[PDB]
Amino acid sequence: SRWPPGLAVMKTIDDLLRCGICFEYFNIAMIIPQCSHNYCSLCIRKFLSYKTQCPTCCVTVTEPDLKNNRILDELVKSLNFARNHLLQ
Amino acid sequence: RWPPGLAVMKTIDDLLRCGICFEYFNIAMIIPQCSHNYCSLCIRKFLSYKTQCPTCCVTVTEPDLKNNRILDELVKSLNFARNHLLQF
Numbered sequence A: 001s002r003w004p005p006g007l008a009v010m011k012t013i014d015d016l017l018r019c020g021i022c023f024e025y026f027n028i029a030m031i032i033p034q035c036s037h038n039y040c041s042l043c044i045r046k047f048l049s050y051k052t053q054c055p056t057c058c059v060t061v062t063e064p065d066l067k068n069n070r071i072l073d074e075l076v077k078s079l080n081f082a083r084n085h086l087l088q
Numbered sequence B: 001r002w003p004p005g006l007a008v009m010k011t012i013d014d015l016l017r018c019g020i021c022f023e024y025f026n027i028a029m030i031i032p033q034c035s036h037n038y039c040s041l042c043i044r045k046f047l048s049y050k051t052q053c054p055t056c057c058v059t060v061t062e063p064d065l066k067n068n069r070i071l072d073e074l075v076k077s078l079n080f081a082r083n084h085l086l087q088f
């Protein structure tokens, strides 16, 4: 998941688009509205079945709180496309 | 903008642009019911005139809005990258 020579600066953006639970690019990104943290749907829903809190900041969170953060899905798709188009 | 080598990055630029002011998000707010995003001031001003999402027309009021803090970080990071890749 690396860029052509001289695009090391892209790492910051790549890192922002990765879930803190699984380290993969957001898959069906969900926001926790009370704290603005984001996770893959499956990742966060699995965590909340365990503990009803944000796995980053510890604020109380229940499953009905979660909302889709659709723009992150769009960004993941577009960044993957960009990266592959450049490596070509 | 991006040099020709990196023209594809315009796709990422486009996703970080507020649909009200056409500038990169400043203090991004998400409308949770529809997942569209706008600069905080842009959408709050719009809602004082018409209580709807500018893109999808669902009813929205100011108490609905939540910070989408990841977008501000993405804007900051992409600005850095762009400003250091002008001669790529």
Ligand SMILES: [Zn+2]
Pocket (backbone or CB within 6 Å): A019, A020, A021, A022, A023, A024, A026, A027, A039, A040, A043
């Ligand atoms: Zn995940």
Ligand SMILES: [Zn+2]
Pocket (backbone or CB within 6 Å): A032, A035, A036, A037, A054, A055, A056, A057, A058, A059
């Ligand atoms: Zn949190």
Ligand SMILES: [Zn+2]
Pocket (backbone or CB within 6 Å): B018, B019, B020, B021, B022, B023, B025, B026, B038, B039, B042
């Ligand atoms: Zn705006």
Ligand SMILES: [Zn+2]
Pocket (backbone or CB within 6 Å): B031, B034, B035, B036, B053, B054, B055, B056, B057, B058
């Ligand atoms: Zn909308």
